[PDB]
């Protein structure tokens, strides 16, 4: 009945064997919640590595793929590559992806069925940008987003929503842990009307905003958080309390 | 005085850890000439894995790196992290990454500005496309192409210059050696009105056009082609015959 708390960790464009050597040491031996399932996303060229070397029960996410599993695409990955190399997880549509690489609703779409189909796991990610939000048409864009996604989702026990309030990224702007109950509880809203009650239910939708240890606890106490998609904490000891924000 | 035959290996999205490895076995017990420099270009999550697997005679290079060491670019990598593998060079610049995803002439010499600063080896691609070739403005993309990234080259000796007819790339159409001849002699006089004259006798410019066994003969006997950027055939075992190319 109760949906798994999610915590995934984006490392982004970071770290060498050495530096991220040392951040899977620690995880490893650190003291996690059970409750929480676990998720690394390193960059394509440490995804063999930081599967080799991380533990079994912590998974391991590309930060990106293309829509086919072969092909005349020079510098893209497959999930058939991803797969290849032992890790079950890819994040998809980050707002990083969407706005410096240009990276459309129509494109992540297409990646997010051929990602499911071939049997990955899929971190899905969405969010409105400053002007939208301040304009009023957070619902708007977000539940555009969110279909762009769920059109191409047939079983959605392998998927994971994750709202980035893109809005008080590099702004003035903050994001409350109100707010981002408010923007989930409505994804899960859409999700009862749109697919079904048991979908809405069982989803975890994670917060993809500033996530750290000082912060994660009211975050996660909130009714429709699920977890976290965390960015630059993911790379420090720290995140070992926001996998344990529950504890 | 001569400047060294350079044969690269395009792979593009294709391949695992078993075709990838049955592909690498062939290279490393073929009689290759020590006259050719080959370098193979990997996927990036089989970047590590080609480099551990393949004789240290055979270089390895990205297909696409992005224009910072570190960052918020999710799904990126960068120079730092090619060179923590062991790889000493990067495709830039190829068709595909500016066709299919949009990458501009800016983004390209920013690109090529900070591989060759983090110490990497550049092969940088330029070529017109159909439209380009059939209005008969060849010399104008190519000129502005090569510029992009000349402003950015302060050391030309780790770059390499790939000619790519993207009017030949499944329109149905065929560049014959002549043509490619014809286009990589005023390339060469373009470095060398432009740039320097030394620059133009030393910098290797190869023929990434569509090269086989049964062409590539006739392609690397042309005076100013000095190598080849292949695509399909680096992934077979011809790819051997390519490399002995002049023997």
Request: with cysteine; aromatic share 8%; net charge neutral.
């Amino acid at each position: 009945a109760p949906r798994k708390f999610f915590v995934g960790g984006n490392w982004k464009m970071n770290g060498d064997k050495k530096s991220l050597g040392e951040l899977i040491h620690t995880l490893n031996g650190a003291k996690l919640s059970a409750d929480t399932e676990v998720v690394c996303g390193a960059p394509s060229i440490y995804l063999d590595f930081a599967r080799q070397k991380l533990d079994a029960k912590i998974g391991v996410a590309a930060q990106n793929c293309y829509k086919v599993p072969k092909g005349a695409f020079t510098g893209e990955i497959s999930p058939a590559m991803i797969k290849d190399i032992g890790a079950a997880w890819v994040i998809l549509g980050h707002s990083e992806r969407r706005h410096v690489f240009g990276e459309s609703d129509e494109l992540i779409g297409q990646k997010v069925a051929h990602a499911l189909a071939e049997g990955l796991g899929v971190i899905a990610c969405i969010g409105e940008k400053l002007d939208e939000r301040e304009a009023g048409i957070t619902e708007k864009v977000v539940f555009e987003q969110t279909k762009a996604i769920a059109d191409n989702v047939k079983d959605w026990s392998k998927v994971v929503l994750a709202y980035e309030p893109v809005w008080a990224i590099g702004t003035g702007l903050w994001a409350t842990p109100q707010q981002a109950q408010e923007v989930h509880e409505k994804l899960r809203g859409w999700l009862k009307s749109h697919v079904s009650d048991a979908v809405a239910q069982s989803t975890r939708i994670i917060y993809g905003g500033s996530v750290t240890g000082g912060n994660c606890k009211e975050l996660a106490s909130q009714h429709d958080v699920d977890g976290f998609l965390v960015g630059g904490a993911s790379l420090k000891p720290e995140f070992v309390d926001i996998i344990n924000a529950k504890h």
